[model samples]
Target: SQQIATAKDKYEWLVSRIVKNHNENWLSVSRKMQASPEYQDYVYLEGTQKAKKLFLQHIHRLKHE
Candidate 1:
């Protein structure tokens, strides 16, 4: 599914990858993703800060549910 064809797709994909692994004891998913290969593709296409903000939204959405 890495064949992401749009900026929005890439952004959602990157956020999902990190958010998928979220756990109660976790730390630094962002840093872990930044060290990954996909991070380059995501950051280059959509930039880091904006994608990261959306990631937090999804994470908290799950947390408060």
Candidate 2:
């Protein structure tokens, strides 16, 4: 019981780190979008906004029980 709970806690910590890495990559992609003038207004302003929001929500769910 106690051991299982501890293991679960450790697993959650790992999951959080993975989520952080994923988010970082997403941010990097977002930054690159800033340089592309052709896609500036529509891609970054609209498309990426929606994608990141959904990505965060999905990651939250995936990392939770």
Candidate 3:
């Protein structure tokens, strides 16, 4: 099953959304990722939450450029 998956570029995409869209906060960024229920749910796979959380964990490391 395709229950498990990884975003092509979670970090870069996160930047695009959080920065490009003026998220103001990384937590808000992740929340937006789930705003649309039509998308799907986290399958608790190998790199699902782990990878996203990883990006979130480092979102603070980024500058507001």
Candidate 4:
């Protein structure tokens, strides 16, 4: 399917999770996400670096809200 749309769909859950309980180190949190079962769906098409960027983007959005 669509890369951008699907990536955002997957990242919504991921970023939310990170924002909730795992709100700490960015790189370390990304590592945990990579090793996590929750990230399984994204492994097929998403890249970790891109995901991290989106992660930061989402966190920034939340900060302004």
For residues 1-51, write the lDDT of model 2, one tens digit per residue. 463444334333433444554444546554653454432444433455554
Per-residue lDDT of candidate 3, residues 1-65 (tens digit): 43333333444454455545343554555566555322223422334465455455455445333
lDDT of the structure predicted as candidate 4: 0.66
Order the numbered candidates by lDDT, best leading: 4, 1, 2, 3
Please provide TM-scores, in order, for all candidate models, with all chains considered together: 0.51, 0.32, 0.36, 0.62
Backbone clash count, each prediction separately: 0, 0, 0, 0
Q: List clashing residue pairs in candidate 2.
A: none
Residue-level error in angstroms, candidate 3, position 44:
5.7
Q: Per-model C-alpha lDDT, please?
A: 0.61, 0.47, 0.45, 0.66
Give one digit per residue, the lDDT tens place, for model 4 in 1-65: 68567666766677677665435666777776777655545655676666777677777776664
On lDDT, the candidate that comes out on top is 4
**Candidate 4 Cα errors over 4 Å, as ranges:** 2-4, 21-23, 37-44
The Cα RMSD of model 1 versus the native structure comes to 4.6
TM-score of 3: 0.36
Model 1 ranges off by over 4 Å: 1-17, 20-27
lDDT, residue 26, model 2: 46
Estimate candidate 3's alpha-carbon lDDT, on a 0 to 1 scale: 0.45
Per-residue alpha-carbon lDDT of model 1 for 1-65, expressed as tens digits?
Answer: 54555555655566666677445222366676667667667667666665566566666766773
